[model samples]
Target chain A: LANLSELPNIGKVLEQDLIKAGIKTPVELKDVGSKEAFLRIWENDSSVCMSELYALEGAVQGIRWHGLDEAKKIELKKFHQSLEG
Target chain B: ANLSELPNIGKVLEQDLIKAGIKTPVELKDVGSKEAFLRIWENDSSVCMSELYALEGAVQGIRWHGLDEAKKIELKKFHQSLEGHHHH
Candidate 1:
């Protein structure tokens, strides 16, 4: 999403993981960050594993996501709205 | 799994992996050591060290031993994404 590196502890590797999971867009990443909601959709799916969750948690707390470019932020916001609307 | 078991995989990275057919750690570990991986990012400037580190870590289970949990997750995520992007 936006700049994967922008996430607190994130770098190129974590960015790759998100891409591998088919979450290239920032909007998709926002959803992934809320894995609990996703699990509900997938019927309690435990696909992402725990280590990945920690990575995300680290990102949520460690990275400064607000630093994303205007376009990227807009993209994430749009995606977020799409999910809700 | 509990989500924390996966060393490098995160919420964002997990979604990417699932989209690319890498939904499990076994798959992640399997693809993490492939040769095509090295070649995929060989020319990309933004992903070199982490790419190499992931391959090495996956194949040998932490060989160089300098990376931490978060860093390892980053490397693993990168490796996973590279495999999905492979044209061949």
Candidate 2:
């Protein structure tokens, strides 16, 4: 299995949390997809910020969250907003 | 017994479980933690892995975060393995 740590934007803290969230591998993350994976992490730790969500999206898409297209970022922001409320 | 009667399940999770077709503790147990979680996620994209672990912990009558590290790792492996089959 691919290590969660190897995924883009996943460092020690997020990697540990991913394991805690039962997402131990990059393959699992890909299978779960970015949205569901972010949901899993958020459920595990509600304190995770929207930046982390962007990070997860970036990791899955193999790009930096900051480099994501404006439209995609906007869509993710809207989704995050819906999650908060 | 009521779904919420299970350990670690709150009102929100209970309702979510019910919506996922897990209306009773027996049903939840029968499906097991990973499958139960997959069911919820399949039904509603919003359900998270913490909820999955919460369900597992509830079935085992232990705190979700308190689950043994080895078992947690084992579960993670099983979860990843399940996904592995789909990637092929």
Candidate 3:
């Protein structure tokens, strides 16, 4: 892993999410884990959806932020269907 | 890229994106550059333009400050090419 603590934007909340996903370091972000697995943890207690996930990943990679539109937000809601099917 | 790719994004944007119907980065890239993104921000008044620009720039490897008139049109064209029939 590339050292999760080194990521500038990662905070306590994001750190917890990473830990819950068993992702401790930046390198683990690239690990071949299932999106479903991560989502399962993310979606369970929190209202977090796909867009937030995208942003978190972006932030970890040094991407400041990804804008979320209403349409994009709607699309993320539908993403679960893809996982189910 | 997928949601897991970025960091610092909290649950709120995730919920908003889910509501908007964007699931993956490709889907996000396709619809993100459009006015829809702005409109959504207008509704929330929380998602900042700089951050949105940052998201797109990060994936494209281009700085938002570098975007010019021609670059916007080019970005639109790229978005159109990636867009499929369904824009839901």
Candidate 4:
């Protein structure tokens, strides 16, 4: 994918968030990883929630978060849990 | 059982909230109405403003239609603002 907008589940809404987070392209997204990338965006956009994390994971995995393997999704859940702490 | 007990949650909506890191009604309170709905919307683009009102009703522990005129008006304005995002 040339950019985040080209990835599954990413549209102009999150595409702008990711770009604002310093992840302008798919490569930057992979390099930053899902959780950290989400953290960066969340710092700026308090509206961000677990969905962004799941979508980021989906993008990195090259699939929609709805199709993420159970184990992978569980890991993302745990990461979001940590933030509630 | 708790999140499921909410007015708008009796199905996948409950599971979705749990997955979004809002397992209990108490946790839902922390996220508030709009953020909780946005979290769901952020994940599932299919969610519409109805779900948002359902969530506010959940927060109020009432049916969506049971919302008072004041709150309903506030929610309507918020939904209108999302259209500015040009939501799908």
Candidate 5:
């Protein structure tokens, strides 16, 4: 469980998604940041949803997605909308 | 392997198949969705019916979300059969 799955909101599937984005380790994820990592993943898989972005942010913050503050969540939602549009 | 290029299969499921010892979509088809799902599930129980549904769609050369309702219901039933305890 020392891998990405150990992170909050990250299970096996999301863990593989991170790896496909070239984010293999916690340090890499930290350095790349949630937004950039999500963009990298979305480039390969357009089906990626805002929920995954929230998951990435939650993993980066070491907290659950539900724990994210509304302000930050709103910002992430805006970011997702930007991609959608 | 062009598993990633298959419909309903992108980087994630393709990698999942590769890690599950399926190098190509042809092999994945040969293994079929249920067996492939079983392989992935063997390694990680965290994988849910959505992934299985994706695998099924990939085999059928269609989008999982676009799968016919009847097919989806059957897949859901299979998923429920597998997960007699867990819900979603």
Candidate 6:
């Protein structure tokens, strides 16, 4: 597996979880998209926080989680809201 | 009294806590980590394990990384097992 830790927001903990979720590389993360990657991780381990979703988006877009554009943030929020139903 | 005043909470996490009906640090502490986390999860299923650790760490006035290994493991187990419940 590639070193996913090289990705923007992934650290040791996130890397392990992502691997457990079957995302072994930055390429795979990008291929799967942040939402799917997050859902995969959620399926494997449910305790992941919403911030991690932002982090994944940030990583994919090459920005900090807090720096995500408002439009994208709203989109992600809507996606999460849909998941709650 | 705002959630941002808590140890691990920030603006984004504060918004999430507010959405979860935890408006103050005191309220967060009152419910404690597990209950506070469950409240958030019930309100929003997007919450993840790291956030759970963040909540527990915040109540304890420590960094998320500061949580003990045993405690983390227990929390993980609790979190995973929660999926089986109805969560009404």
Strongest candidate by lDDT? 5
Judged by DockQ cut-offs, the docking class of candidate 4 is: incorrect
> What lDDT, from 0 to 1, does candidate 3 have?
0.50
Q: Name the 10 consecutive residues with the lowest summed lDDT in model 2 chain B.
A: B79-88
Top of the candidates by DockQ: 1
Indicate whether candidate 2 or candidate 3 has the larger lDDT: 2
* Candidate 5, position B3, lDDT: 74
lDDT tens per residue, model 5, B26-77 = 7988989999998998888888888988898777654575467888888888
Q: What is the TM-score of each candidate against the true structure?
A: 0.29, 0.47, 0.34, 0.54, 0.53, 0.54
Clashing residue pairs, backbone N/CA/C < 3 A, model 5: none
lDDT tens readout by residue for model 5, A1-85 = 3699888877666777789989998889989988999899889787766666777888899996767888888898799889898
Q: Candidate 1 lDDT, tens digit per residue, A4-85? A: 6465644555555565556564556666563432233224333333333434544554543333345644444454345444
lDDT for residue A19 in candidate 2, whole number 0-100: 80
Model 1 chain A weakest lDDT span, ten residues long: A37-46
lDDT for residue A46 in candidate 2, whole number 0-100: 79
Task: Give per-residue CA lDDT, model 2, range B19-84, as digits (tens).
Answer: 888888878888888888887777776666578678887676444665678778777776665555
Model 2, TM vs. native: 0.47
Q: Candidate 6 regions off by >4 Å?
A: B1-88
**Runs off by more than 4 Å, candidate 2:** B1-88
- What is the CA-based DockQ of model 1? 0.14
All candidates' lDDT scores? 0.47, 0.73, 0.50, 0.76, 0.80, 0.76
TM-score of chain B of each: 0.40, 0.78, 0.46, 0.84, 0.87, 0.84
Q: B23-85, model 3: which lDDT tens digit per residue?
A: 656665666545435544545656554445545543343334434567555555544444432
* Residue-level lDDT for A17 in candidate 5: 76
